[PDB]
Amino acid sequence: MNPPPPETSNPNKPKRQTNQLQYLLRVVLKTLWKHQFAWPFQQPVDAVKLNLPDYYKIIKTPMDMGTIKKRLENNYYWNAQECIQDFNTMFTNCYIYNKPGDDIVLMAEALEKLFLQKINELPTE
Numbered sequence: 001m002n003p004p005p006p007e008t009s010n011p012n013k014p015k016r017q018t019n020q021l022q023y024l025l026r027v028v029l030k031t032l033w034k035h036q037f038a039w040p041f042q043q044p045v046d047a048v049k050l051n052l053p054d055y056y057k058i059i060k061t062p063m064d065m066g067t068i069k070k071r072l073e074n075n076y077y078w079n080a081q082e083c084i085q086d087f088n089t090m091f092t093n094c095y096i097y098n099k100p101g102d103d104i105v106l107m108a109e110a111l112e113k114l115f116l117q118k119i120n121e122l123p124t125e
């Protein structure tokens, strides 16, 4: 069964736009999105569709790039570090739910390397 997906708006949470957050959307997310391994990570895990009834029994902080994209578009984040933490949660969820050597883990490992490559240098404010 599926829990509600992570929020992408929250009226009482303070919003912010920075050069780094704009970069995280325009270059980091939108480039990763096009990678041949991006497809599993473009939407919340649908445990009913994918037949993973234990996914949310194991993963208590779900995250995916579709949620991240919507948060960036909505200026949901205060700073770039908050957004980077969501990417890191997404990758670690994959490693936690699975095991070394699985096809999905190989995909996450490749995407994490590309992600780190792109966040190594960010614009200045």
Ligand SMILES: O=c1cc(-c2ccc(O)c(O)c2)oc2c(O)c(O)ccc12
Pocket (backbone or CB within 6 Å): 039, 040, 041, 045, 050, 052, 093, 094, 097, 098, 104
């Ligand atoms: O973490 C994941 C794990 C799996 C997965 C699927 C079938 C299996 O037999 C298995 O052992 C693991 O599938 C995913 C997926 O399809 C996504 O879109 C995003 C994340 C995952």
